[model samples]
Target: KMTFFPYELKLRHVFTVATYSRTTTPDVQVEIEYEGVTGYGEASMPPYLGETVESVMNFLKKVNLEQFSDPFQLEDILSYVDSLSPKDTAAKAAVDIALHDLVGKLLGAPWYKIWGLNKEKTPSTTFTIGIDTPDVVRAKTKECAGLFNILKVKLGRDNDKEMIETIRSVTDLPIAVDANQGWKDRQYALDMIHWLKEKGIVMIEQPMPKEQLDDIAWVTQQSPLPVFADESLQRLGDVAALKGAFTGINIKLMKCTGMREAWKMVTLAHALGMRVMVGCMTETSCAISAASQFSPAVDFADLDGNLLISNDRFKGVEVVNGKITLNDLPGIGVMK
Candidate 1:
């Protein structure tokens, strides 16, 4: 039997980016029970993804788990789900995650070990601090300083320089910046990348609009720091198209329909000799935990969505001083 419900996750602070801001994350929690084992999943509905509780619930209603007995046949099951809708990746992710969890539980092993990945290769996840006043920015940085080693600062605003300056005043830690497709001018984007490199910034993500591939390709050629495509990249097919435009691709479960496709993406990106980062929306530990299971397969992680929120109902993955600590528990390792 499969069951689901909705919940709201309250952020510890206002999460602001270049284009939008929010203080709460709407989520649809899901579970699938088969042969006495239960697996959990969550739909992390980031506003930008255009998914909501109602939309996800409506999609889940179309899923009939009893039609298939084996959750391990992920490809067939997910393919069936994908055929039901042209969109609703978040909804598909919820069901996809639950099935993976169920299969892991049945097999008595976590997905990472099942895939034969060394847990030590899991990269340190970057904690994100959104656009805000200098004082708020400094305070947020200080709050996470003890827990995280690297900071991801949201830019693409009028105070982009000041935001970096504020963090510089608080600490000299290595930084990652996400412009969120905010920059429009090709020359200005190039100039900013040059200046940001001097501030010890390690990477830049989605600096310009997604469609401006020629401009992005130009910036990528000149950028001192590695450039990653966030908004521009989606699904397994999008990887080949972004070959020269950006140095890496950020995979988020909410967008790619969960772990199955995300794993596919990592493998493809690796084959292409491209950098891969597994990121997240404003999500609970349920989805974050699922995403973390494959952290060892990627080059970078932005899996702090659960950490940024105050009311994460489930506990699965642990972030120890900016590092992703995967648990030995079966499935996604989440508990209520």
Candidate 2:
């Protein structure tokens, strides 16, 4: 028998390198402990989801201990959690990651080895340049050019080309951009997509909001860059709806609520010919460690969480350059 413990961590990071969209540091990090070992993970609450440190703590206290107290019966845990709607995905993900950690220790295998990954180094991950003036974007680019290969730029509703030029000035690395629904107009999004095609942009994420689902399909049909869906593809059922709108689905384990469902989404999407890009919220190794288990299932991976934060609790995957590498340890195979 093992006992479980939960904790919350507050970290502060700057936007260009760490922060995004807003201020206030309104995010919380979650971790779960069992027996003498601690497994780590983070929730993707992002304040936009209306989650906070207090709310997460309150919910955890209310969670039925009977379901998760027994680590051996992990399959039955989600059933009890599903009874609650508007699930705190971030918190659930944090706990789920910890569970994987505990399991890995019991099995006596490193996480990547368990996932069948024999590599010892992680691939180079894209470093994001958030919405900023062109000049500022260039200056930021120069600072991290040699450190990463894929450079992801964030765009708002205007000046898409100018933003591209800003980063292009710093490095000629493979470029990718995410609009985050900042492209409000259909024509504008198309114009930007056309421009990206000529520029060799890899893919663009959520150029339009979910309300513009029809537009996504329209744009992807003609756009040169591969289209990826974030908000447009949240639930398992949403995958069916996004068939026409996207060529790839950004799989965030927390967004899927549980590992079982995440696997189902990946299985379903691949069966339908859509590419998979495993992503992560700015979190610790706990979440990244868990997501890395499903790394092979993705076409591209953004498991940079473990690399972004300095005060990581456990060890699981080793990231080299911008990529993440895993080895066989056990269970989920990692330390929090």
**For candidate 2, lDDT tens digit of each residue in 1-336?**
223243333344554322344323333444445666654445655566566777666666665644456665666776565555576776666556656666677667655555565454345566776557777778878887777778777775456678787777667888777788877678888998888767767878889888888877888888877888887876577787777679989888768764556777888888888877778766656667677777766766677765555566667677566666665666554653
Task: Give the alpha carbon lDDT tens digit for every residue of 172-217 in model 1.
Answer: 8889898988899989999999999999898999999998999999
Model 2 lDDT-worst window of ten = 1-10
Clashing pairs in 1: none
Per-candidate Cα lDDT values, in order, are 0.88, 0.67
Superposed model 2: Cα runs more than 4 Å off: 1-12, 16-38, 66-70, 110-123, 331-333
Model 1 residue runs over 4 Å out of place are: none
Model 2 Cα RMSD, Å? 3.2
Look at candidate 1 and tell me the lDDT of residue 119. 77
Instruction: State which candidate has the highest lDDT.
Output: 1
